[PDB]
Amino acid sequence: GHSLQDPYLNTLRKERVPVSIYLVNGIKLQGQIESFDQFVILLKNTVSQMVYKHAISTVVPSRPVRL
């Protein structure tokens, strides 16, 4: 379990790929993942706003990255 999202997000963070997290409300969140943990991911926005997983919906990278 939980063996797939961990490496995916770790690779997205390592290469600092610009992800566009579309919330459930239809709001864009362009930024780089600074870190991630349980019930939380850390964006690299100018303010580095801390987001919650339960609210997050999609995580699309602008540039297709390899697994």
Binding site: P18, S20, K28, Q30, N45, T46, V47, S62
Partner: protein, 262 residues
């Protein structure tokens, strides 16, 4: 008093700008906002601290290919948030758009393709203009005032270009471009700051590399800060210093009555 000097320069490559000492003139011209369109380099290239101006936050989106385009934007004060892309391939694949939110106002950076290199570039320009009027009809629908710092590569009226009879076929005055711009301005109610503050002719921004054209002042006014009429009234003045041309476009200087804040 309440003032806000928004600066825009289509460097057409940040390297040529740095060669001309543009960074020094910008750091000395301490203003509110400074936009550098057509970086012609990746963000990693802009990461060089030389380009970063003291007291500003560097934000830039690079095209798929660094030399293709890319746009940067300095801000005296940390914007509320910075976003890139427009959903269209012609925009996302080339980083031709980058917005920096503030408060009840979002100063956006637009980069329309030149359309002067080849016919395919002009076709892409038409497609981008259509998608952009669509994005304007879809985005302004959200409560917000927009300052579109963009180099449109199009002259609206004969007042924006001399010897127009020779430029009818030249890109920038083509019938479809003129019609699209007239629709964007009048049908949608959008205005421009410079023309509003000064309905003066001979004022241009883009000049050909040919030295004779610069000597006799054969220039084009391709840059327009098309903005919502809400902020239109708050324009104070506009200027186009004829200093040694820092890039294919000239320095567009405008001061507003509004003052941005986080």
């Amino acid at each position: 008093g309440p003032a806000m000097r928004i600066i825009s320069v289509n460097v057409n490559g940040i390297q040529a700008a740095a060669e001309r000492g543009l960074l020094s003139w910008l750091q000395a011209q301490n203003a509110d906002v400074i936009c550098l369109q057509d970086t012609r380099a990746s963000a990693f290239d802009l990461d060089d601290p030389s380009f970063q101006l003291d007291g500003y936050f560097l934000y830039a989106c690079d095209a798929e290919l660094p030399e293709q385009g890319g746009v940067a934007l300095y801000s005296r004060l940390q914007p509320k948030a910075v976003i890139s892309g427009l959903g269209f391939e012609t925009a996302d694949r080339y980083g031709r758009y980058l917005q920096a939110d503030f408060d009840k106002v979002s100063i956006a950076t637009l980069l329309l393709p030149s359309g002067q290199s080849g016919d395919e570039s002009l076709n892409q320009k038409f497609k981008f203009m259509d998608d952009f009027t669509h994005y304007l009809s879809k985005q302004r629908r959200k409560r917000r005032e927009y300052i579109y710092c963009g180099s449109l590569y199009v002259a609206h009226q004969k007042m924006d270009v001399k010897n127009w009879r020779e430029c009818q076929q030249m890109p920038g005055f083509l019938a479809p471009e003129r019609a699209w711009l007239d629709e964007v301005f009048g049908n949608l109610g959008y205005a421009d700051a410079l023309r509003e503050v000064s309905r003066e002719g001979d004022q241009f921004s883009w000049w050909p590399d040919s030295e004779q054209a610069e000597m006799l002042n054969l220039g084009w006014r391709f840059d327009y800060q098309v903005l919502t009429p809400g902020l239109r009234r708050f324009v104070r003045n506009a200027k186009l210093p004829r200093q040694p041309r820092f890039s294919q476009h000239a320095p567009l200087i405008v001061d507003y009555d509004w003052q941005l804040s986080i």
